[PDB]
Amino acid sequence: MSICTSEEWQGLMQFTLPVRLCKEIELFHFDIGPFENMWPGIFVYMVHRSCGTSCFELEKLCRFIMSVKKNYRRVPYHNWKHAVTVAHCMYAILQNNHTLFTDLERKGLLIACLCHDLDHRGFSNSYLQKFDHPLAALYSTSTMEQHHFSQTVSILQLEGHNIFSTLSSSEYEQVLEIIRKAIIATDLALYFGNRKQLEEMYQTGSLNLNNQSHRDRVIGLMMTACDLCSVTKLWPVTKLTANDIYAEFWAEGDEMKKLGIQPIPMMDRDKKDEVPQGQLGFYNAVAIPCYTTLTQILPPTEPLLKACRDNLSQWEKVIRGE
Numbered sequence: 453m454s455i456c457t458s459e460e461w462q463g464l465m466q467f468t469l470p471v472r473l474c475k476e477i478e479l480f481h482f483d484i485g486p487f488e489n490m491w492p493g494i495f496v497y498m499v500h501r502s503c504g505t506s507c508f509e510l511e512k513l514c515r516f517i518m519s520v521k522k523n524y525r526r527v528p529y530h531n532w533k534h535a536v537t538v539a540h541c542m543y544a545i546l547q548n549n550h551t552l553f554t555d556l557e558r559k560g561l562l563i564a565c566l567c568h569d570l571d572h573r574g575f576s577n578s579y580l581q582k583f584d585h586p587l588a589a590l591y592s593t594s595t596m597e598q599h600h601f602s603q604t605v606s607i608l609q610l611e612g613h614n615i616f617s618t619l620s621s622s623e624y625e626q627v628l629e630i631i632r633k634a635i636i637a638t639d640l641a642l643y644f645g646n647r648k649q650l651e652e653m654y655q656t657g658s659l660n661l662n663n664q665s666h667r668d669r670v671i672g673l674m675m676t677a678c679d680l681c682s683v684t685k686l687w688p689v690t691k692l693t694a695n696d697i698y699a700e701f702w703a704e705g706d707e708m709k710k711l712g713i714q715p716i717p718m719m720d721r722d723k724k725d726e727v728p729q730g731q732l733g734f735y736n737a738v739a740i741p742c743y744t745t746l747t748q749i750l751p752p753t754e755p756l757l758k759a760c761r762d763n764l765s766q767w768e769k770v771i772r773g774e
């Protein structure tokens with residue numbers, strides 16, 4: 453594990469958020485893009501507004517965040533920027549649904565989101581499961597996500613980083629398990645079953661938020677919605693982020709090329725022409741149904757669906773020549 457320097461977390465401690473951003477941060481469509489130096493402070497802020505200023509010990513929180521940053525890799529997409537973007541979308545969903553979730557869940561989900569892709573290498577579970585490589589060995593299924601949670605706990609175990617130590621022993625294991633499950637949920641492999649179960653649960657009426665199994669499934673879809681939130685930003689942002697996503701995909705093709713394997717079109721840089729069609733298929737089968745089910749369960753999340761609906765309309769334009 454890599455540790456933050458003294459000036460990094462103390463600098464974050466002294467950081468105050470600009471007043472104009474406070475109003476904008478509340479919105480679903482908010483793009484963190486133009487404020488890089490303010491990303492850790494944006495997270496501090498969201499935690500304080502959601503959970504409280506004294507919830508976490510500030511010194512520990514600031515040490516936690518800056519260290520979390522240093523354990524995100526310098527990769528095109530699954531990087532520190534992605535983590536904050538996912539975290540912010542969670543804050544937005546929470547704020548519009550505040551009382552549905554306990555303080556422990558809100559604390560848990562925000563930290564989980566920031567951590568959910570820790571030490572990502574830009575490679576998929578498929579790549580690691582086919583090659584091996586001592587990560588598919590350690591984690592047979594779902595896989596990078598188990599690594600991300602493992603990484604999260606490893607950071608919490610660094611000197612003065614454990615933001616959760618002041619919780620009761622019961623709450624401490626509660627929050628860790630909330631986080632474990634939330635991070636595991638970001639394995640898109642598990643998303644498809646989860647959304648179908650929830651679709652069934654909502655449609656029949658059987659869905660009950662007091663039901664802990666149902667509750668875990670709701671949080672799971674929330675993690676998926678947040679992980680996908682770049683499909684819900686303004687088209688120029690959405691479009692540019694896709695470039696970072698495929699840059700990773702194509703590199704996973706390149707390494708498969710370097711070791712005598714022929715990758716899928718999605719990961720073949722010699723197949724860029726297929727990208728807009730793959731994006732349409734991704735929205736139609738993944739993003740659209742995700743935000744549709746989430747709006748049915750958490751109605752205040754509708755803006756996320758509409759921004760996705762507009763971004764689909766943009767991808768159809770690319771396809772048709774416009």
Ligand SMILES: COc1ccc2nc(C)c3c(C)nc(-c4cnccc4C)n3c2n1
Pocket residue numbers: 640679680681682683694697718730731734
């Ligand atoms: C797993 O193939 C794909 C294929 C197309 C994708 N298009 C988008 C926009 C996207 C966003 C935001 N996020 C992810 C994602 C989700 N789960 C794991 C990895 C990624 C990059 N995708 C995509 N993923």
Ligand SMILES: [Cl-]
Pocket residue numbers: 453454523571
């Ligand atoms: Cl690491």
Ligand SMILES: [Mg+2]
Pocket residue numbers: 568569596597638639
């Ligand atoms: Mg991930």
Ligand SMILES: [Zn+2]
Pocket residue numbers: 534538568569638679
């Ligand atoms: Zn992610």
